Short mmCIF file of N, CA, C and O in Angstrom, two decimals:
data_model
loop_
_atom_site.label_atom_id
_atom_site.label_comp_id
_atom_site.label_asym_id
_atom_site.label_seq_id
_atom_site.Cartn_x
_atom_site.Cartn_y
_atom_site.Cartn_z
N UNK A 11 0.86 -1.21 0.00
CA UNK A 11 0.00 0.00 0.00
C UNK A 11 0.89 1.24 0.00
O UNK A 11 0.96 2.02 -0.95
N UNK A 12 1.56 1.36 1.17
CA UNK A 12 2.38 2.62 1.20
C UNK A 12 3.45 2.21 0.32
O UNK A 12 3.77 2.95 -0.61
N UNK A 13 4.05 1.10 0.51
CA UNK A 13 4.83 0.20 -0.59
C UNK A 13 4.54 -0.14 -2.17
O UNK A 13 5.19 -0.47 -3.16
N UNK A 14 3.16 0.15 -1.81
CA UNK A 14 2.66 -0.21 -2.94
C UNK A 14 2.63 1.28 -3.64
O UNK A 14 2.81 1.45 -4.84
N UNK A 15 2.40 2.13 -2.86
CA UNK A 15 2.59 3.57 -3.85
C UNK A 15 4.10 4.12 -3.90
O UNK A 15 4.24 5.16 -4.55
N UNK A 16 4.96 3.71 -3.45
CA UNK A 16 6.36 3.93 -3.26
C UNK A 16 6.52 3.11 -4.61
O UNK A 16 6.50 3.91 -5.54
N UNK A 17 6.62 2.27 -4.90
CA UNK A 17 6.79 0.92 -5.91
C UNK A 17 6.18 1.95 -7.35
O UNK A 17 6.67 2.38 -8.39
N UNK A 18 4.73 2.01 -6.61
CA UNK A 18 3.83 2.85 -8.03
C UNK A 18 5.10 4.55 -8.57
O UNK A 18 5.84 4.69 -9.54
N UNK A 19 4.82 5.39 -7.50
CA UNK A 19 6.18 6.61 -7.88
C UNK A 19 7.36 6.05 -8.59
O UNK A 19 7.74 6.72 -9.56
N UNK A 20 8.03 4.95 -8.32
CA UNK A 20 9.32 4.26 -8.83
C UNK A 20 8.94 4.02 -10.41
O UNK A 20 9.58 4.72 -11.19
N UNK A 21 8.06 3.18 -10.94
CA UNK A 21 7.56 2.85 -11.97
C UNK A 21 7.34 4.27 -12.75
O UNK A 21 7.47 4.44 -13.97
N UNK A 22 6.97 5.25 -11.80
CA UNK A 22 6.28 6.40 -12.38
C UNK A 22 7.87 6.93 -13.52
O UNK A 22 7.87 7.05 -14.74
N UNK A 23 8.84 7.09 -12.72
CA UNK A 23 10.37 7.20 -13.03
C UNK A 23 10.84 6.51 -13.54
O UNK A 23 11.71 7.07 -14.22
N UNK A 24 10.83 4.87 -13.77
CA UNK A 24 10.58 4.18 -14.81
C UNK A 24 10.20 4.50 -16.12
O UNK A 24 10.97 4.32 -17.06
N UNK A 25 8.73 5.11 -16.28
CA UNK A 25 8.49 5.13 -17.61
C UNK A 25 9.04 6.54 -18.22
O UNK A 25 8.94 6.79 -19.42
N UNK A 26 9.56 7.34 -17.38
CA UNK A 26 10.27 8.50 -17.91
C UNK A 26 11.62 8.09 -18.36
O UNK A 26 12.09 8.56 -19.40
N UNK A 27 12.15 7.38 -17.76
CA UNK A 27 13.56 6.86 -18.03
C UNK A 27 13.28 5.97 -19.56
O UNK A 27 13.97 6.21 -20.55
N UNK A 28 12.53 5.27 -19.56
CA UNK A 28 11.86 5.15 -21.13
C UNK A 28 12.15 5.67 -21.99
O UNK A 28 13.03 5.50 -22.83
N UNK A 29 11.16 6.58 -21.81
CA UNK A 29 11.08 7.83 -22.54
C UNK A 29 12.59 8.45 -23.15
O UNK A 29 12.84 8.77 -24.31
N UNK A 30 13.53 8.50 -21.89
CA UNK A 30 14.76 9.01 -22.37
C UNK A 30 15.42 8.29 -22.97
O UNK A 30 16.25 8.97 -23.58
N UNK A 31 15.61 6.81 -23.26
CA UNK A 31 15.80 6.39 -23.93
C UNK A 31 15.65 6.19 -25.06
O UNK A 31 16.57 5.97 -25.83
N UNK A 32 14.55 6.22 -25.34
CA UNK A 32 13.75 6.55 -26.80
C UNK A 32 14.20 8.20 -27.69
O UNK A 32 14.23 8.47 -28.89
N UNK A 33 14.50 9.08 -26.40
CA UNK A 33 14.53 10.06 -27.12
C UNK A 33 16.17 9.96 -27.49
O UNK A 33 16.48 10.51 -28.55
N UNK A 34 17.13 9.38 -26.80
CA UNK A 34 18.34 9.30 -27.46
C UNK A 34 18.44 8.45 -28.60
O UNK A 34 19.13 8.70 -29.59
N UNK A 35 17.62 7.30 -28.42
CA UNK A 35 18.00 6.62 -29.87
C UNK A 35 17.50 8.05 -30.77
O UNK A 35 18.40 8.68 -31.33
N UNK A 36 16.38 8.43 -30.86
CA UNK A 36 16.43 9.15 -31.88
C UNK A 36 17.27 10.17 -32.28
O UNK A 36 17.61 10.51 -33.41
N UNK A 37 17.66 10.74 -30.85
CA UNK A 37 18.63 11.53 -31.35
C UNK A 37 20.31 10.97 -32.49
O UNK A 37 20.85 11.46 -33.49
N UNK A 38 20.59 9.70 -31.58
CA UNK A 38 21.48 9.33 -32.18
C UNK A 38 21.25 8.90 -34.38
O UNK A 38 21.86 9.01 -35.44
N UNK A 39 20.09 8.45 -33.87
CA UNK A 39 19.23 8.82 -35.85
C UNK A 39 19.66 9.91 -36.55
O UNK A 39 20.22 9.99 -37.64
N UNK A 40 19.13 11.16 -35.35
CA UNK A 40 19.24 12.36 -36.07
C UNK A 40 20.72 12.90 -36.47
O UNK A 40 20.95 13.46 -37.54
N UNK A 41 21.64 12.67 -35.52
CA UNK A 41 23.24 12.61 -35.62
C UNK A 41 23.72 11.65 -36.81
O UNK A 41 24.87 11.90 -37.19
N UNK A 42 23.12 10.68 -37.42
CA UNK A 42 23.48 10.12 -38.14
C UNK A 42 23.34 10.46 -39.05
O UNK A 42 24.14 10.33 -39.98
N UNK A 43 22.17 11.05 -39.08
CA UNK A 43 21.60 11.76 -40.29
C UNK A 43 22.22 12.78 -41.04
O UNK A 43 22.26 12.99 -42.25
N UNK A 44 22.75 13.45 -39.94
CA UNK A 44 23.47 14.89 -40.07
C UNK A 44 24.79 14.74 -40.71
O UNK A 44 25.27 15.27 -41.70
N UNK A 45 25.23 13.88 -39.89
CA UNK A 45 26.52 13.19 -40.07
C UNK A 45 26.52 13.23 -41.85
O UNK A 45 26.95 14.20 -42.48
N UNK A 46 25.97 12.00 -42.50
CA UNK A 46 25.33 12.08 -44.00
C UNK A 46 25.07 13.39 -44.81
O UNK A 46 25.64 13.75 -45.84
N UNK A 47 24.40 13.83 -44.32
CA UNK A 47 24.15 15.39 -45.07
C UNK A 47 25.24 15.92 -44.97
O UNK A 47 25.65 16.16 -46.11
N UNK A 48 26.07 16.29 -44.06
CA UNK A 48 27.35 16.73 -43.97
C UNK A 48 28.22 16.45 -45.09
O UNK A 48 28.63 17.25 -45.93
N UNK A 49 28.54 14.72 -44.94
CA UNK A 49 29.51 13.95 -46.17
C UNK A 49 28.87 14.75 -47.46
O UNK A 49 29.61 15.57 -48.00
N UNK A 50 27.60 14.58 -47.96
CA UNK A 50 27.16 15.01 -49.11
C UNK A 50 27.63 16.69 -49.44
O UNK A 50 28.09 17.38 -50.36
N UNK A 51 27.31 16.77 -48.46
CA UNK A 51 27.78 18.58 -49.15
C UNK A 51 29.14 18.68 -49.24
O UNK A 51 29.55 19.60 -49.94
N UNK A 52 29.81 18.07 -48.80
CA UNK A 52 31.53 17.78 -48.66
C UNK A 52 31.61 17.12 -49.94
O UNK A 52 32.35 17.67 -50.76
N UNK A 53 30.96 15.96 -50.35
CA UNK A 53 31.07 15.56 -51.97
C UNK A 53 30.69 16.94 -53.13
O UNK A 53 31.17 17.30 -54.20
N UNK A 54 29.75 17.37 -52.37
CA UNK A 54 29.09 18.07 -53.51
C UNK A 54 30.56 19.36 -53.54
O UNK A 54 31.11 19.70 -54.59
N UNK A 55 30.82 19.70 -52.62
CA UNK A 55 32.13 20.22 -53.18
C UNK A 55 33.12 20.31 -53.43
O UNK A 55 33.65 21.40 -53.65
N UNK A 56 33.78 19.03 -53.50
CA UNK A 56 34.57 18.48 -54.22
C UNK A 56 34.81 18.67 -55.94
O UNK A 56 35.63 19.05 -56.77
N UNK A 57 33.04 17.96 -55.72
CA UNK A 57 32.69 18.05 -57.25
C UNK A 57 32.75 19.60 -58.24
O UNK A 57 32.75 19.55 -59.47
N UNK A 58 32.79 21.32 -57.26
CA UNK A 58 32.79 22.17 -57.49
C UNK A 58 30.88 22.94 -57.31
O UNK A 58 30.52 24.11 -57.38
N UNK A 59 30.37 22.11 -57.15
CA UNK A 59 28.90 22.89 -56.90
C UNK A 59 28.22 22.76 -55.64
O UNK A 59 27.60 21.98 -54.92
N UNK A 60 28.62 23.92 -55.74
CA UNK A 60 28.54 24.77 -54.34
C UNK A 60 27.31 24.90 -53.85
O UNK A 60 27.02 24.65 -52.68
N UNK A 61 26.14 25.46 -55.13
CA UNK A 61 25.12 25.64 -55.02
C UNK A 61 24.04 24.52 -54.49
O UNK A 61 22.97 24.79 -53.95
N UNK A 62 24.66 22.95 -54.83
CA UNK A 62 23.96 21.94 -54.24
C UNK A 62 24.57 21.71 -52.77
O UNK A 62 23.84 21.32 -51.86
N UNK A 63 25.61 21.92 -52.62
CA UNK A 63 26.53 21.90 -50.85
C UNK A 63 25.33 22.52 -50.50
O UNK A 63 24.48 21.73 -50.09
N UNK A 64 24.91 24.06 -50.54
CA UNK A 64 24.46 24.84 -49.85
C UNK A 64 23.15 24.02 -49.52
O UNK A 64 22.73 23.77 -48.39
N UNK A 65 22.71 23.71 -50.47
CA UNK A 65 21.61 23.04 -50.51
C UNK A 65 21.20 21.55 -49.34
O UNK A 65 20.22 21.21 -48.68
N UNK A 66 22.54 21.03 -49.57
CA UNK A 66 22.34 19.98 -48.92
C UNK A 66 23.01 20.59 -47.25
O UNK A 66 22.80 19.90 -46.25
N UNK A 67 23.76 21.83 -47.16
CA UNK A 67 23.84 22.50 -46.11
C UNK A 67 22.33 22.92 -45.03
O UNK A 67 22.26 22.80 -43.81
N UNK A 68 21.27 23.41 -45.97
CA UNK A 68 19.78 23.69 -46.05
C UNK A 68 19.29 22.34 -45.01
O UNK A 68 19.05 22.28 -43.81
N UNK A 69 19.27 21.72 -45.70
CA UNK A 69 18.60 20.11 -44.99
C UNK A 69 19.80 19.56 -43.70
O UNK A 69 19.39 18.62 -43.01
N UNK A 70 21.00 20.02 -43.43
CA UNK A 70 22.02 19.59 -42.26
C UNK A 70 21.10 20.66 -41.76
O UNK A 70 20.06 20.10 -41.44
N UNK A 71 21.04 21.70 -41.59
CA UNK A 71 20.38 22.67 -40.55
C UNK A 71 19.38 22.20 -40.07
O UNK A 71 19.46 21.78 -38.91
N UNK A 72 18.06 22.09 -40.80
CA UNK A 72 16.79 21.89 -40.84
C UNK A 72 17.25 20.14 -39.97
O UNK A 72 16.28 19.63 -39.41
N UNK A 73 17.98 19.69 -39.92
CA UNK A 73 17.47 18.68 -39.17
C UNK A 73 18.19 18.91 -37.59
O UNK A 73 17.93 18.39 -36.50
N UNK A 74 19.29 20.05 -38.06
CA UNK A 74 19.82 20.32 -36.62
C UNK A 74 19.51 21.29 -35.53
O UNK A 74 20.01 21.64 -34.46
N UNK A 75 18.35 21.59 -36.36
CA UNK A 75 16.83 22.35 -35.72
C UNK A 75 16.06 21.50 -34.82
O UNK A 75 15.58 21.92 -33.77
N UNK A 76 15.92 20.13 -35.30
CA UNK A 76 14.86 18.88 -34.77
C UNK A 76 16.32 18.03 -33.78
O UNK A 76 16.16 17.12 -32.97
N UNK A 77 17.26 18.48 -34.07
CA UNK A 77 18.12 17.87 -33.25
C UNK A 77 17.58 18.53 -31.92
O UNK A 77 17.01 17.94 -30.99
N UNK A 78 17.96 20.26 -32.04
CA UNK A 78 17.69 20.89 -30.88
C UNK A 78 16.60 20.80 -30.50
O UNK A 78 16.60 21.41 -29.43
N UNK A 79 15.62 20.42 -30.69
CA UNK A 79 14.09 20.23 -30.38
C UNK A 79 13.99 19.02 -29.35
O UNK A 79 13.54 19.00 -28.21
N UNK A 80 14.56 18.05 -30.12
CA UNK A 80 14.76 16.59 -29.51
C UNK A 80 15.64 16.95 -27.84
O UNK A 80 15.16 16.70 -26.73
N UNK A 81 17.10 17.63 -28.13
CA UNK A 81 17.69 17.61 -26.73
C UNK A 81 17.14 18.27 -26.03
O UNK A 81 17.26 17.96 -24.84
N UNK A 82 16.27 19.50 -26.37
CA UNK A 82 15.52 20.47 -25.09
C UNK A 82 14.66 19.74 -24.59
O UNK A 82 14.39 19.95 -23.41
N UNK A 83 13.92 18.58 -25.33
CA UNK A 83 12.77 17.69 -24.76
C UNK A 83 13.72 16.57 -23.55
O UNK A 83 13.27 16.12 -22.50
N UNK A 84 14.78 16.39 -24.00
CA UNK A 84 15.16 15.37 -23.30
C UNK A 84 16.00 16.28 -21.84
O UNK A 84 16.01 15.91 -20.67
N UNK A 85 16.48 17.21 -22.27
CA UNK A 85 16.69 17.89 -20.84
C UNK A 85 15.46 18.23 -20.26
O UNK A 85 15.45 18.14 -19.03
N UNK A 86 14.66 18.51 -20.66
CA UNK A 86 13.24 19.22 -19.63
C UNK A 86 12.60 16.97 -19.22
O UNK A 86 11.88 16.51 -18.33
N UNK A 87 13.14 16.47 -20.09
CA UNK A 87 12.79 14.98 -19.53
C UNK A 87 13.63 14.60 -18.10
O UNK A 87 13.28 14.40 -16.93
N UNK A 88 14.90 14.60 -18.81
CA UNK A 88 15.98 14.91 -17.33
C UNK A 88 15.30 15.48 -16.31
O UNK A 88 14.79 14.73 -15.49
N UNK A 89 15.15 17.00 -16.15
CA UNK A 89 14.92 17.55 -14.96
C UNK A 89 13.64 17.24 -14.23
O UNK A 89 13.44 17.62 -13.08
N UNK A 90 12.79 16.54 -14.91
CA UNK A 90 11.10 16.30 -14.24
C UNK A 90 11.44 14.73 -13.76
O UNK A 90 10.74 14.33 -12.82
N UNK A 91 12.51 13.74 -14.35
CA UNK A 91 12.59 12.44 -13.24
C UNK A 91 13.31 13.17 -12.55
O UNK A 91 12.54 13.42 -11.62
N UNK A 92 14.77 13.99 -12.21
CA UNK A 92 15.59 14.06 -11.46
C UNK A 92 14.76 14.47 -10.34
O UNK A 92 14.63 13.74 -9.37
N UNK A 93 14.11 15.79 -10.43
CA UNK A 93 12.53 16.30 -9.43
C UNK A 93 12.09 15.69 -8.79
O UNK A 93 11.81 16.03 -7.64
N UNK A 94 11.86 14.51 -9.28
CA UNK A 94 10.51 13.19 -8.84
C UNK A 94 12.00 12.17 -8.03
O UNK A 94 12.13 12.09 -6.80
N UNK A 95 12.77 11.64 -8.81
CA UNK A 95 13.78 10.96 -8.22
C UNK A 95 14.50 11.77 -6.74
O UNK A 95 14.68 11.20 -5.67
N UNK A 96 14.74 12.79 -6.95
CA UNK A 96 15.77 13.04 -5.80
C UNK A 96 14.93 13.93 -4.88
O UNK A 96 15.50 14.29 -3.85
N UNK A 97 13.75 14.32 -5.04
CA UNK A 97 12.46 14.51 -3.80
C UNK A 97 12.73 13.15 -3.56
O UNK A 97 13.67 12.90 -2.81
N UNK A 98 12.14 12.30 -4.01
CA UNK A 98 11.61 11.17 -3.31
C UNK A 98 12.96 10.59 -2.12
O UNK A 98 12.71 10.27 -0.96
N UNK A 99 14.24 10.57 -2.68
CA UNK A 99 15.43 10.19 -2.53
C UNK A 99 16.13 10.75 -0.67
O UNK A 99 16.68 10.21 0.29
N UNK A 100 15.57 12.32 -1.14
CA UNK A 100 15.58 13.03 -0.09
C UNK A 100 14.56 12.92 0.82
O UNK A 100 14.83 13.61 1.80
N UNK A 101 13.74 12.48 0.89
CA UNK A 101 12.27 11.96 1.72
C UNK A 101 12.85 11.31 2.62
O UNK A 101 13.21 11.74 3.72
N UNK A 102 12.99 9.77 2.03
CA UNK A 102 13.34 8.91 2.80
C UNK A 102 14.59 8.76 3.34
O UNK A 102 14.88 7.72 3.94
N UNK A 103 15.86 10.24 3.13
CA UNK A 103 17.00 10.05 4.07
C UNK A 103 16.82 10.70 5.11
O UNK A 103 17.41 10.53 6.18
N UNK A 104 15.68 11.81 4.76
CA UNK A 104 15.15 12.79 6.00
C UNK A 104 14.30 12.05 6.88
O UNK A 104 14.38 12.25 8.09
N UNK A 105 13.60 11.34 6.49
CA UNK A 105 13.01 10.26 7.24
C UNK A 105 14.17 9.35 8.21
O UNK A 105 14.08 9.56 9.42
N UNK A 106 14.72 8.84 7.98
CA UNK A 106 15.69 7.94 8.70
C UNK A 106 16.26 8.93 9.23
O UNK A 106 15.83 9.03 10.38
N UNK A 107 17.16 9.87 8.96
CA UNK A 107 17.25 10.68 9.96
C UNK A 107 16.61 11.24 11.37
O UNK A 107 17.06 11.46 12.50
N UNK A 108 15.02 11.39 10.58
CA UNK A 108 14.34 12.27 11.98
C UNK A 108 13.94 10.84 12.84
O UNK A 108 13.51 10.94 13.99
N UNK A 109 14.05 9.93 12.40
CA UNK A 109 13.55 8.76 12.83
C UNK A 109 14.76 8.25 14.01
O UNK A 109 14.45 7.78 15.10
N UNK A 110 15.80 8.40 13.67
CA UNK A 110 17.25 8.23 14.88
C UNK A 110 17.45 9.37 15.41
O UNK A 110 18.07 9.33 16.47
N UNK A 111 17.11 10.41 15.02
CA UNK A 111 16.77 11.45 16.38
C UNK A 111 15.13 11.10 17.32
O UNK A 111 14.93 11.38 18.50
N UNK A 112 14.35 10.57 16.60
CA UNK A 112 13.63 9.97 17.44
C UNK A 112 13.79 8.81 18.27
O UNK A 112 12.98 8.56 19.15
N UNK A 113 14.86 8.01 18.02
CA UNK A 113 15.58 7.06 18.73
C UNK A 113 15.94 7.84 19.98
O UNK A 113 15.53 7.59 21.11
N UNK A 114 16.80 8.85 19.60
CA UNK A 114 17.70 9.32 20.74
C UNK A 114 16.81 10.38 21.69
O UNK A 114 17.08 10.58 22.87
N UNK A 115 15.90 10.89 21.09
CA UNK A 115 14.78 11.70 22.24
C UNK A 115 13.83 10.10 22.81
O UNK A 115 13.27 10.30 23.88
N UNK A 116 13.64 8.80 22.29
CA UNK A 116 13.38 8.04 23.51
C UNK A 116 14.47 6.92 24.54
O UNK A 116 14.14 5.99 25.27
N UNK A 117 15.50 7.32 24.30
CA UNK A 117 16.78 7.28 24.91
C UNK A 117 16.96 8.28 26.16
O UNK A 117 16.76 8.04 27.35
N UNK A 118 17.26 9.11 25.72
CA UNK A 118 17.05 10.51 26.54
C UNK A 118 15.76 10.37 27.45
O UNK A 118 15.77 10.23 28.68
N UNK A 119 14.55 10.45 26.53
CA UNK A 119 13.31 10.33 27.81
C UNK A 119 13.28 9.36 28.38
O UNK A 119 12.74 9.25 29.48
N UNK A 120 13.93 8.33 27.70
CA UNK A 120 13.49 6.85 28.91
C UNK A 120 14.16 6.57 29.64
O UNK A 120 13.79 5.63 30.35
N UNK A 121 15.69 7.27 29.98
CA UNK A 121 16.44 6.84 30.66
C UNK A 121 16.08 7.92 31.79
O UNK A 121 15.93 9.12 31.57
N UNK A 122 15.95 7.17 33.28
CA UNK A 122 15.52 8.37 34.09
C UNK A 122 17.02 8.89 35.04
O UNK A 122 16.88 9.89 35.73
N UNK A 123 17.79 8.50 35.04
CA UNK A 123 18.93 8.72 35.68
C UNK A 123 20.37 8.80 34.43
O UNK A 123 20.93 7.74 34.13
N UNK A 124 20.75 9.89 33.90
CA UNK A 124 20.30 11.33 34.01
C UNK A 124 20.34 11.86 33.40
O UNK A 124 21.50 12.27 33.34
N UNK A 125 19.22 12.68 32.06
CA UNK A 125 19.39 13.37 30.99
C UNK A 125 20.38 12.44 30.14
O UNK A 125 21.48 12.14 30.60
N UNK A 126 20.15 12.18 29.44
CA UNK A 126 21.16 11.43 28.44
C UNK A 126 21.85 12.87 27.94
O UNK A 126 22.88 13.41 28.33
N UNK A 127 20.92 13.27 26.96
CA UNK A 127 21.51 14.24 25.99
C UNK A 127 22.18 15.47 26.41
O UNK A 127 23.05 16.00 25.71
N UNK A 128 21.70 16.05 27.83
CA UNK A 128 22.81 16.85 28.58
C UNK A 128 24.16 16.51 29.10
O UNK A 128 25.18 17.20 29.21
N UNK A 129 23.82 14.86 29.46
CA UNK A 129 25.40 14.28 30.02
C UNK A 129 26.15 14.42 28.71
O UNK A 129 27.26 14.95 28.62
N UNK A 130 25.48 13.94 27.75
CA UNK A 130 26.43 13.76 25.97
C UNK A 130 27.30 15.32 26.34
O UNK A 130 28.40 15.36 26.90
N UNK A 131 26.74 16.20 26.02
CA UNK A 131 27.45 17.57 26.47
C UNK A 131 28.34 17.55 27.17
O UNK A 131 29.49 17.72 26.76
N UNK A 132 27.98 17.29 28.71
CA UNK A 132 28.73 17.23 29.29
C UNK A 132 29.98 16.71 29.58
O UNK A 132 30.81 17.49 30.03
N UNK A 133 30.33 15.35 29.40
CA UNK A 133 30.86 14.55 28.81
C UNK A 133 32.28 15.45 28.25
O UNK A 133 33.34 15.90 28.68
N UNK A 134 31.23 15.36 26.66
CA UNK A 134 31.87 16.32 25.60
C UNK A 134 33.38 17.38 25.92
O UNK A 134 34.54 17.40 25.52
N UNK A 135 32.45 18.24 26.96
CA UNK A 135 33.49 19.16 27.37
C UNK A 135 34.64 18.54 28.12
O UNK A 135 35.74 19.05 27.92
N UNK A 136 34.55 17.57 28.90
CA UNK A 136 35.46 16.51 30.11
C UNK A 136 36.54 16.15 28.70
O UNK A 136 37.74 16.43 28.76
N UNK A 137 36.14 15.72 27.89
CA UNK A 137 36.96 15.04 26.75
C UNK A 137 38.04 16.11 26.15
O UNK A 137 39.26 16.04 25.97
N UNK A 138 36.80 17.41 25.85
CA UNK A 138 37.48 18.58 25.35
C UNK A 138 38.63 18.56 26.02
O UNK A 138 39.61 18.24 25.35
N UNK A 139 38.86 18.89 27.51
CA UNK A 139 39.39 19.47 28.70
C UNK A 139 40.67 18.82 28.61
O UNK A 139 41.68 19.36 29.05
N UNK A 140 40.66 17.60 28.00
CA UNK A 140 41.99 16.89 28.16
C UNK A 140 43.09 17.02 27.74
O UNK A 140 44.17 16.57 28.11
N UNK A 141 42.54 18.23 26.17
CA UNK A 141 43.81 19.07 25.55
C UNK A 141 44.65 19.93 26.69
O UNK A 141 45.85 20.17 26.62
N UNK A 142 43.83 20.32 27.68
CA UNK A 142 44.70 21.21 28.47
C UNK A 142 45.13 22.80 28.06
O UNK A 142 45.86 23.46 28.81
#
């Protein structure tokens, strides 16, 4: 239940992590792609026509337009699991935390002879003291 929605949030980060995967293969498509258009306009001027380079320069852009489209999606993908991941992450260390200070306030209260957490202090300083 509570496990079971802890489990459910996890999955939730799951299918985003998906997602990012999917969006790199494509990206890596689109890099390939580019890659290609690139070679071609590099043939095309070899060959002396420039006017088709440019051309095939035209279509390297236009896809390195959808490149940038693709990585802004996948960073704004990044930052909405990292959100969800490292809230959640931070939950449960703040939890265990307040949870062993709740250890030590029923330590402290249950011990009736004497103050735990003032002797800790006290203590403390006795130890200090030994530098001299």
């Amino acid at each position: 239940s509570n496990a079971k929605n802890k489990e459910s949030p996890t999955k939730a980060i799951v299918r985003l992590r998906e997602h990012i995967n999917l969006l790199s293969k494509k990206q890596s498509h689109l890099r390939t792609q580019i890659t290609n258009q690139e070679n071609e306009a590099r043939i095309f001027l070899t060959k002396g026509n420039k006017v088709m380079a440019k051309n095939a320069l035209k279509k390297k852009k236009t896809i390195e337009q959808l490149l940038s489209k693709v990585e802004g999606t996948m960073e704004s993908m990044e930052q909405q699991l990292f959100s969800i991941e490292s809230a959640n992450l931070n939950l449960e260390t703040m939890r265990a935390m307040q949870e062993g200070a709740k250890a030590m306030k029923t330590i402290h209260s249950g011990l009736d002879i004497d103050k735990v957490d003032e002797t800790m202090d006290e203590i403390r300083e006795q130890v200090e003291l030994g530098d001299e």
